[PDB]
From a paper:
Csa3 family transcription factors are ancillary CRISPR-associated proteins composed of N-terminal CARF domains and C-terminal winged helix-turn-helix domains. The activity of Csa3 transcription factors is thought to be controlled by cyclic oligoadenyate (cOA) second messengers produced by type III CRISPR-Cas surveillance complexes. Here we show that Saccharolobus solfataricus Csa3a recognizes cyclic tetra-adenylate (cA4) and that Csa3a lacks self-regulating “ring nuclease” activity present in some other CARF domain proteins.
To elucidate the molecular basis for cA4 recognition by Csa3a and any conformational changes induced by cA4 binding, we co-crystallized Csa3a with cA4 and determined the structure by X-ray crystallography. Consistent with this crystal form, the asymmetric unit contains a single Csa3a homodimer, and the overall structure is largely similar to the cA4 free structure. As expected, a single cA4 molecule is bound within a two fold symmetric pocket spanning the subunit interface at the base of the Csa3a dimer. The unsaturated Gly96 main chain amines and the Arg98 side chains then mediate alternating interactions with the phosphate groups of cA4. cA4 is bound in an oval-shaped conformation with all bases present in the anti-conformation, radiating outward from the oval-shaped ribose-phosphate backbone. The β1α1 and β5β6 loops project above the floor of the cA4 binding site in an alternating pattern about the dimer axis, where they successively interdigitate between each of the four adenosine moieties. The first nucleoside is thus bound in a groove with walls formed by the β5β6 loop of subunit B and the β1α1 loop of subunit A. The conserved Gly9-Phe10 in the β1α1 loop (motif 1 of Lintner et al.) play a pivotal role. Notably, a crystal contact with a neighboring asymmetric unit results in a cation-π interaction between Arg200 and the solvent-exposed adenine ring of the fourth nucleotide. Local to the cA4 binding site, the most prominent conformational changes are modest movements of the β1α1 and β2α2 loops as they move away from the dimer axis, expanding the conserved pocket to accommodate cA4. Critically, the α3 helix runs antiparallel to the C-terminal helix of the winged helix-turn-helix DNA binding domain. This small rotation of the α3 helix is, in turn, transmitted to the C-terminal helix of the wHTH domain, acting as a pivot point for an approximate 7° rotation of the wHTH domain relative to the CARF domain.
Author numbering:
A (entry chain B): 1 to 123, 126 to 159, 163 to 173, 177 to 191, 196 to 212
B (entry chain A): 1 to 212
Amino acid sequence: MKSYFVTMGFNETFLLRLLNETSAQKEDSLVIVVPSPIVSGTRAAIESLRAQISRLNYPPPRIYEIEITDFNLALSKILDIILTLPEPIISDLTMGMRMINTLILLGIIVSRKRFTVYVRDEGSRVISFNDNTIRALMRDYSREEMKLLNVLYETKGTELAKMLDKSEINKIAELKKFGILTQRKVELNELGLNVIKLNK
Amino acid sequence: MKSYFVTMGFNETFLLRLLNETSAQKEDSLVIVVPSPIVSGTRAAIESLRAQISRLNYPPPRIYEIEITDFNLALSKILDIILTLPEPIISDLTMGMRMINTLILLGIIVSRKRFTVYVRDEGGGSRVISFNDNTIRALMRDYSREEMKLLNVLYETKGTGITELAKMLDKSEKTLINKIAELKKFGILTQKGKDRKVELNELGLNVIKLNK
RNA sequence: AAAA
């Protein structure tokens, strides 16, 4: 079970693609935030989405309208919605107004809930990230960790154990949860490259 | 001197509006990131921009072209550009590809640099929100139980002078001043009026709402 | 790539 949290523009097909790609189920939650007032294009897109959801056995959408006047007053409404969504929260920034997508994006990050955000090339190519990515980039690494990463960066991958001079691993599984390295040779991933780049 | 970091689509109007609303100077770094390869509508918007920039003594744009294969690979390239921009970084995410603007936004936050982001209304309207680095750091800060006790009081009294706050919290005014100065750095409270009553602003309300 |  999961939650979809998106805004809606004039084209419901972006959301239909997201719902099928991630195998949406009826038990899931679908929450659509739209600007106030609801313009004709957005309303038509919602009715078009209702008819197509009712055929495909998807979850019924809940629609929230919010005025977009102040960054904090609008974030306040986005946050109240977010605390009512069970994790993980699936989001896609390719559709709807940029202002509202910005508030959704910032809303899930500061809420510290689990999430997966997708962003597409126009509506073919696609990139994604999650709460683990953001937390791995926002983390203040200690020097025991930082100089271990810098060694892995310079050695490119127990030969490691006789460099920092320790025993022979509990920290390895801890850093594998942050997705910054893998594991035989301990291999640093691209996310770890960004880690080191942020703290050099 | 400031710096501007934006991406470009087919329309330069929002960038020229940004430059006009923030009083852009010729000594500023204007940096534009575009996808690779540069398509013809983006080449045309960039030529339309340079003509108007020269006539208004705006900064000349330095243009970088980025490939976007993977999230981490593309962010890596955005960070290289960000980490050579002088602070503060002024950005406007209402233009160009959404993928690039997401990386620009995410790149700026994690670079811990100073910034102001604008996001406008596509339909041309006057609706516009903005935020800055203190905004994000405020919402993500780990607030101690003691710090939360102080914020909870300002919400229930709606403004209280330093002397009464020190009484309500069983602390010295000397130590309350230092703590109020530290919270003021994050932008979550202000102290206006001739009575110097400490008050929670809208940002402080969101901070309190996150810890319930 | 201005509710794509």
